[PDB]
C-alpha cells in the first residue's frame, strides 16, 4: 500500500 | 517559477558488513528524501498519488546522486549519511566491487573532477524527481513542465556561475544516463539481498522494494 | 573537429512471432551499425580494441535509438529495418508489452512530439557511441573529448536550426537516461531469450551477448 | 573473441 511513504507525504508537521 | 536558491536550500536543509551498513543508511535517508522532496518548489502541490509515484520511481537515483556528491573528497570510497565511510576494498570483499567501482568512476570521480556544486546536484536531483516518464502519473505534462523549469534554471545558473565553461550544463545532464544505469544495478542487488535474506532490510527500504 | 554534416551523412548512408522478427532485424542492423560507426568522424582512428569496446557497450542503445526514430510516423508500433512493422498489440501478445510500451511512450512519441531530426538523432547516437564510461578503454579521455566535440556541435546545430527553442538541446540529452534504461531491459530480455532457447538468435547478435 | 566485430572493423573494403 506504500503505507510509510503516504504517511510521511501527507503529514504537514 | 523554479528558483535555484530554493533547490540549494533543500540540499542544505537535509545535511559490520558494508552491504548491511549501506542498506541501513539507505533506510535512514529515505525518511530524509521525503523531507527534501517537500522542499523542492511545486512538488508538494502535485496530487499525493503523483508524489508517491515520483518518489518510488526516483528514490534510488536520488540517494545515489546524494552519497556520490557527499563522497567527492573520499579516497576510493563513499561517505554514508550514518558517517560510516566505505572503501572499494570492503565493497570488493563483500561481492559488490563491480557496482561500487562504477559509482566511483562514473559518479564520484566525475563530480570531483568538475567540482559539481550543491546547486548543480540539487538541480540534477530535482530533474530526476520530476520524471515525466514515471508510469501512472495523473498528468505527465505537469511533471514535464516542472522538469523543464528546473533544467532552464540550471542552465541559467551554469551560464552565470561558470561562464568560462560553455559545456558544463551538457556535462551535468550527461551524468544522468550513468546514474540511471547504476541505479538499476543497485536495485537488482537490493532485490537479490531481499530474495536471499543475506541482509537486514529496514521497513522503508523494504516498502520501496514492494510491488506497486 | 566534429562536423554535424558528416554525422548526418552517416545516418543517410545506412538507410512470424514478433520477438523472432525483432531479433532477426537486430542481427541484420548490427552489420549496418559497424558501417555507420566507421562513418562517424574519428571513430575509425581509435585503437581497434577501443572501437570494439564502444560498439559492444553501445550497440543496443544505438539500434533502439535508430528503430525508435524510424517509427515516428507509425501508429502505436515500430518499423524494423527488414520493413516489418510491429504493433504494440503483437508485442503484448508475445509477452513483451511492457518494454514495447516504454519504447513507444518514452522514445518514439517524444521523438515524434519534438520532430527530432536526423542530424539530432545522428548526434545523440555519436554521443552514445563515444561513451567514455565504457570499461577497458585504452584512453577514456580521448573518448570523453570526442563526446564533448559531438555535444558542442549538436548544441550549436540546435541553437542555429531551432533558435525558437532554448531548451531543445537539454530535451534531446534528457532522452538518453530513458534510452539507457530501455536498452538495459531489452538486453535482459535478449539474455533470457538466449537462456530459454525460445527464439532463433543469429551469429552477430549472439556474439554481442558473449562474455567480454 | 568477438570474431565478427573485429573482422568487420579491420576491413577497409
Ligand atoms: C554503492 C554500492 C552498492 C552495493 C550494494 C547495493 C545496495 C544498493 C543501495 C543503494 C542506496 C544507498 C543509499 C545510501 C544513502 C546514504 O548514506 O547517503
Ligand atoms: C522493442 C521491444 C523489444 C522486445 C524484445 C526484446 C528484444 C531486444 C532487441 C532490441 C534491438 C532491436 C533492433 C531492431 C533493429 C531495427 O530493425 O532497426
Ligand atoms: Cl559524459
Ligand atoms: Cl525529459
Numbering used by the authors:
A (entry chain B), D (entry chain B): 471 to 483
B (entry chain A), C (entry chain A): 298 to 312, 333 to 529
Q: Would you copy out the relevant sentences from the publication that reported this structure?
A:
The nuclear retinoid X receptor (RXR) is a unique family of ligand-activated transcription factors, which in humans comprises of three members, namely, RXRα (NR2B1), RXRβ (NR2B2) and RXRγ (NR2B3). All three RXR isoforms typically function as a universal heterodimer partner for other nuclear receptors, including the type II thyroid hormone receptors (THRs, NR1A1-2) and the peroxisome proliferator-activated receptors (PPARs, NR1C1-3). Here, we report a complete set of the crystal structures for all three RXR isoforms in active, ligand-bound conformation with an identical ligand. In addition, we discovered saturated fatty acids, including palmitic acid (PA), myristic acid (MA) and stearic acid (SA), as RXR modulators capable of inducing the recruitment of co-regulators to the RXR ligand-binding domain (LBD) and hence, activating the receptor.
We next questioned whether PA could also bind to the other two RXR isoforms and therefore, we crystallized and successfully determined the tertiary complex structures of both RXRβ and RXRγ with (exogenously added) PA and the GRIP-1 co-regulator peptide. The crystal structures indeed revealed the binding of PA to both isoforms in a similar manner to that observed for the alpha counterpart. Overall, binding of PA induced similarly an active state of RXRα, RXRβ and RXRγ. The three structures were highly identical, supported by the superimposition root-mean-square deviation of atomic positions (RMSD) of 0.29 Å. A detailed structural analysis showed that PA occupied identically the canonical ligand-binding site and engaged in similar interactions in all three RXR isoforms. No conformational changes were observed for the residues lining the pocket. We observed that none of those amino acid differences were lining the ligand-binding pocket, confirming previous assumptions that the RXR ligand-binding sites are conserved. To understand whether the 24 amino acid differences within the LBD region may have any indirect influence toward ligand-binding properties among the three isoforms, we mapped the differences onto the structures. We observed that although most changes were located peripherally at the surface of the proteins, there were three substitutions in the proximity of the ligand-binding pocket (site 3, site 11 and site 15 based on Figure 4a). Among them, a minor difference in the lipophilic residue at site 15 (α: Val374, β: Ile445, γ: Val375) located in helix 8 might affect interactions between helices 5 and 8. Since helix 5 is involved in ligand-binding site formation, this difference could allow contributions to subtype preference through differential ability of helix 5 movement in the RXR isoforms.
